[PDB]
Amino acid sequence: AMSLENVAFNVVNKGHFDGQQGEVPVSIINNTVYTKVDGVDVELFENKTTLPVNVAFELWAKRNIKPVPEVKILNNLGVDIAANTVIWDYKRDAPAHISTIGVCSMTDIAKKPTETICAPLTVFFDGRVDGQVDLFRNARNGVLITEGSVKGLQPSVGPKQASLNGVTLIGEAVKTQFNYYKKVDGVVQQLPETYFTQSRNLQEFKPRSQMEIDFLELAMDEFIERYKLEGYAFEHIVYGDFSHSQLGGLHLLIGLAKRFKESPFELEDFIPMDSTVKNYFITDAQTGSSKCVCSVIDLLLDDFVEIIKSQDLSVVSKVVKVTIDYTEISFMLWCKDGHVETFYPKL
Amino acid sequence: AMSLENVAFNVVNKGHFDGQQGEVPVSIINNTVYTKVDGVDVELFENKTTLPVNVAFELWAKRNIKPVPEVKILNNLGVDIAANTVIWDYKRDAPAHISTIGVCSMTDIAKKPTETICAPLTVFFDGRVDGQVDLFRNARNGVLITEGSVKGLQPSVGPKQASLNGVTLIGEAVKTQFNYYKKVDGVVQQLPETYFTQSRNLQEFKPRSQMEIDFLELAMDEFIERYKLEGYAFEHIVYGDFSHSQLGGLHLLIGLAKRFKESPFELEDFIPMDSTVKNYFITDAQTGSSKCVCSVIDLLLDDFVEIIKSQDLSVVSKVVKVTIDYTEISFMLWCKDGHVETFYPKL
Amino acid sequence: AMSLENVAFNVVNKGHFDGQQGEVPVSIINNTVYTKVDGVDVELFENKTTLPVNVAFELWAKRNIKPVPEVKILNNLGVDIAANTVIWDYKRDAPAHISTIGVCSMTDIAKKPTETICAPLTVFFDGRVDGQVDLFRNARNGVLITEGSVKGLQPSVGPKQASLNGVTLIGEAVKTQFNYYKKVDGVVQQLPETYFTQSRNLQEFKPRSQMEIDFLELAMDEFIERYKLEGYAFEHIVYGDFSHSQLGGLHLLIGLAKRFKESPFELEDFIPMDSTVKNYFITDAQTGSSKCVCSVIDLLLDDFVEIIKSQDLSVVSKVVKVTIDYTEISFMLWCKDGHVETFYPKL
Amino acid sequence: AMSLENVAFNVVNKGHFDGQQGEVPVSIINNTVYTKVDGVDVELFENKTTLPVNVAFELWAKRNIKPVPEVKILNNLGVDIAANTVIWDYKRDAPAHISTIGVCSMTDIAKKPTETICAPLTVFFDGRVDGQVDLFRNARNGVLITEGSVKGLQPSVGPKQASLNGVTLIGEAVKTQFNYYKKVDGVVQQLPETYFTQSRNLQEFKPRSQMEIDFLELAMDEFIERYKLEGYAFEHIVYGDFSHSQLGGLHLLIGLAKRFKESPFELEDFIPMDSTVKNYFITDAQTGSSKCVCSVIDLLLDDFVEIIKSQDLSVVSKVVKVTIDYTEISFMLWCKDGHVETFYPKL
Amino acid sequence: AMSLENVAFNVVNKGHFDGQQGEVPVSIINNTVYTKVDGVDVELFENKTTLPVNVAFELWAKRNIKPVPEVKILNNLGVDIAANTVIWDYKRDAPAHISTIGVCSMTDIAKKPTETICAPLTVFFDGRVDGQVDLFRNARNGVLITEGSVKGLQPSVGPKQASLNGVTLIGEAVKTQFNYYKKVDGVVQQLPETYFTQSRNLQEFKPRSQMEIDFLELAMDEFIERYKLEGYAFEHIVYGDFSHSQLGGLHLLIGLAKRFKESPFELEDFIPMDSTVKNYFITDAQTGSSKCVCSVIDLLLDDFVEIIKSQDLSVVSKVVKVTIDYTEISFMLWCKDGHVETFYPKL
């Protein structure tokens, strides 16, 4: 059975819900779950969601603690429901998919896991758990991650990193590299050859390739010179221009770190969630420059150079379709006179 | 085990917690417990207390549905805790005794029912349940009600009336009259001879003796002279005087009903609870007479006459103490020239 | 467009949302919508639902004010969604169907009005509005009510009464009699010859047939004798027995009125909603009799007699399926020695 | 000094704040003030306003309990602030004027009394309290009510009834008849000869003149014939027409009672407050007739006849200025062919 | 007297409640106390407790600002209530002991400071305040801290550090070293010779002895061999092993700092409170290693070596009771073949 006091017991001892037996007093006051440890109330959980507090507490305590794909990957892959587990979105601080089936009943609106309302539901399956590959096979539209490989199916190599307990990481002790399978209309797919966001951030930016180490360390103009990037105008699209109140270009996280190292400033995430492209409210604390909305995307700088290389320069103002995180991101690219005038993900 | 969804199950089927097994979805939103009946949320409970909503829901669903003594009887008898049941104060919409032991743990603050902090608590025992008489025997300070009689103990006859599911009543189908036992320091106290409030209501006042029928029907002065109450000032202490803005008298519910028959007015209960003497805020709609506070007692008119008779009138400004509902209520009785100037429950 | 201030404007002038233009200040504080009429906040709406307050306010202001089928009829007919209007459930004090499509986009979970997610949605169509018959024709599974009659479809006569603004009534000035059509899997249905609840209550019970007037007025035993009901034991199944704490029989609203007239008591609806059978918590204020759960059903007493007449008495303990309000209600009917021992809707 | 525990003390003993000394424990939980009477929390106050709960509790406990003018009178007279007391609006269940000066510093926004920000406020003065006449004299824009009469000022006779503790009444023991004075720009006014709403309701409608008693008792057509007002068409403007879904006319409370006496129906006040004209959502439970908005006004039927008598019939569709409750109410009157086609307060 | 506005005054000027005179406007909105500084509301306090907001505000403003023992010390010493002061638990953001006697009356469940209900309460006395030593003498069960020394009583040296305004510290300017006294059942105790937690953390770990500086600076293996720790397996019980997803050993804060210096990771305190042993949810951001629950204890590394030295190695799987912070903490210690297989505080 599922009870609030048992869930609170598990949380108090383990921090998540295993399924032990034992119960503890629980108090609920205004979107908050307290328990009386040693005669004093301590806050176990605080509902930041739009769900009822007991519902969200029971979803949170049941969250997945093994490494899992980042929620942006599942959004791009169209996942709607997770089978037999809960994916917690530590950005939103709430479950990734509002309904849950194969986990608990009153979270979902679908009648049955394969009912008519629940047919176009793209499920998610965790190969590391037994039987999930089978459930994939018998599924209508589903996405499967597997720790290793499965028979009779072409794999698809995903990102190096995964989210473990809300921190993204590349794991030695843990395999944060899964193989992906997709079956829409019961028919396996051919996942596109795609590009993976590195999922980094300014205050802890770490270069992951020699080009990145050169970018961070080398001076500006001699870096453009050194990697033969003179014709592609990285002084704006990457390096970031501050000569005006309206901050210009600067649509790569690498450039943001390369400037933030000089003088810190702030990023204002007005839509707290996860996506391949992230719109920030950017303000330069040194010069006073600020852009109302700035679309930042975080490729490998190696991969940024590769995609810019593979692109012809003939079209004056072209739109490119590049496959990032299994989704087609469209890049606006005005090329003037055979050089890169502007290049960023179109709003 | 103790489960919120089990409690809601019982409430949905039975309206109270029996102890069946089954669960129903539960949602908590802002001091309110809902459940999904046939796909729609219906509100099971709404917390009017100062307790956490799940705590109060569990206490409410565990309330006693057999006839029970009115809470004023238990307050006067000093009861502090009930054993193995919950008394619901439908006046306050909250349990009668905030702590609860012998039922559940985290409600009470005493460590153990026998522990030192819990020794000086007057417990309440329900004879109709088995074993409770024994528990009363082995109890330090306790009050016991029995439907019939117990061996080796002098009974004490209480009111004919009782609270069944929050409505007070006299029952032939159900025995609403109990025998009372009180033990202080394990020593069986002898209960005083006492008078009982009739717990009647203003809107639905019903005479319970011939004198009351005469009061309601007979004219005023013909009534005072008819029962020979001319020297006892019933025209003020009972009938109530409306000549002035400051309302006078009206300290018996009988007189309030006698006026309310002639014209409705409003009684405002600024302290919603249950007591032997109840202070009301009176506004007379016809005359406009109003008194900020007026103490009302609903003792039997027969027994009111009896107490007024048994009392000498020599003392000008005496204070009587009569035992009502097992507690000493003191009236102020100012007598002038062998008759009663004023007489009411002193504030 | 839809805005909170426009909706509040409409509510302030009309009481519901027509679609006028004009806006008024709005304040939201804790599940409550206020507006500043002449410099003072007046409460426009108070959210009793589990929906966000602005969502529920906009649903309520958009509710249907023409006469509509009672929500129990729509539940029985399986309706899941209403097209182009909102049905307010004044019992629950919340919308009858949580999602809305054909009305508003951010209340439903189905992607489109026509989608695989919304294939099994039994929609509701209001023939009194233009185009709704056509939408019914093109619909997958739908229920249509029509003011008069439609071509090519067998009608189905529904109840005499409808719900107008939350009060149920039979209308002279308004036609509260609709014809019903059901198309599951695209194919028209054959709505069963059914029995209709009269939707009455104790506070204002009014007889609707001569047998009912005899029941209310005539004495008990000579009424059983007069309509030749001696062999069917209406003293229990209808009249209601109070000889014990556990109240017996008494499963018809008419018997409830026939007793409540003698001495009033209370009914506790612990599941506030609408259904053909309603479980009450019943307590006899005179005798002190009380049943924890009592299933009450309100047929026409004429129709009760007819259904009991149609039943053979051979089966000792039979279960009868009778079609009430387009749904199969099953009575348990214990017949001993050719007479009606017990007969009530089985729990 | 003003403290929450002192205020709660006064409320617990008196029901309002006198200014005694003594304090009681107070708890605040979610717009509610509780106090611990004899070990149990009892709810003292529940905030229905948009003010902070302690602010509103301290305003409520300081409300005026002497008879006071109805809030609609003060609105019409333009009162913005009350000096040295609080007017509670029991309709809205909140103070009549949000700010208070001369009472409490942290409720108003004007810096000081008679300040430049405070100059254009019409204050209210209670003659029954000492010094208020003087404060009126020295005031810029003020309205004074006096129990009796004042020297050097023409009085103005107000309504017979006043609001005492939220119930309107004509008082014998209390003088609910005040004389009014208005001084705009420090210049005394000439209050118009006006007509007064009687402030009645359907549940307890009581005729106040012989014509009203005839209206209630007499049949319709012979009542029109009897008082000989056949040309003025009271079958619509007063009696109310019920032959259509859209209810017709029926803009006088007297007519509403004359129907509600026959068969009860429901009034839905969608703007809970006080005004000379009140817009109701009206529905006929018998016929099924219903009007979305109905402006009801409650004169003395004597005075209705008087205003209709003083009316010329030449203008086909005229707008009439009539002084009711010291404010100009406009009646629209389609009077075609010398007869009263339609006549009601224009929306 | 105690009032909300006076308390807010003190807080606004001083930050805590001294007892000055003066009052300031206060607003309460949803577990938050605001005051109007210069015409704008500023938030004074925000209720994180389970107490009523005014109750908690008055407790917080009355908190102790002199250095005080860590709440874990008082928990271990069994303290139930403080006398004449409030200990604030800055971990929980709530008072350390729910009930207060000598502070205010509506905080304690005990009827009196000295009563049968409050006999078994271990009170806390602050010797730095006058009369508290005397109150200790006359006390039933009490714990006293003294700044210096008292006559006729054996002292007991406590920890070097105290909590001043929620930050723990060893004080030069302030004496954070008290002498402890315990009188259970009126008889002075013999406080055990015990070990004291150092109360440090990863973000600001600072070594406090030469052995600790060697630990932080020296690499692993030469540190084990250098302090003769080869046979005691500090590579697991202290250094922490990351070869697997399930992190191993690592039950000393010093080892946590010694690793966190290399690569940072996170600690999730799922039970926010204070205790001698603290269960963390630990995840290695570099290797991906993570343990669901990890009991961390923070001795002086010198004292850890001392306890491991004093312990025999004969028992294969022993449990050691060592007195830390005046309480008996038991380590599980699996010794295999004369070496320390595992050693950590048993869960």
Author numbering:
A (entry chain E), B (entry chain D), C (entry chain F), D (entry chain B), E (entry chain C): -1 to 345
Paper text:
The NSP15 endoribonuclease enzyme, known as NendoU, is highly conserved and plays a critical role in the ability of the virus to evade the immune system. In terms of substrate specificity, NendoU of the coronaviruses is described to cleave a great variety of single- and double-stranded RNAs in an Mn2+-dependent reaction, by hydrolyzing the 3′ end of pyrimidines, with a strong preference for uracil, and to release 2′,3′-cyclic phosphate and 5′-hydroxyl ends as products.
Based on our biochemical results, we performed cryo-EM data collection of NendoUhex in buffers where the enzyme showed maximum activity and reduced activity, such as PBS at pH 6.0, Bis-Tris at pH 6.0 (two more active conditions) and HEPES at pH 7.5 (a less active condition), detailed in Supplementary Table S1. For more basic buffers, such as MOPS pH 7.0, HEPES pH 7.5 and Tris pH 8.5, the enzyme activity of both NendoUmon and NendoUhex was virtually negligible. Despite their similarities, models showed consistent differences in the switch region. For samples in HEPES at pH 7.5, we observed that the canonical form of interacting switch regions assumes a more closed and mobile conformation in comparison with known crystal structures. The overall structure of the hexamer is also deeply affected by these distinct conformations of the switch region, where in pH 7.5 we observe a more contracted form of the barrel. In fact, this open–closed form model seems to agree with our biochemical data showing that the enzyme is far more active in acidic than in basic pH, where the switch seems to be found in the closed conformation.
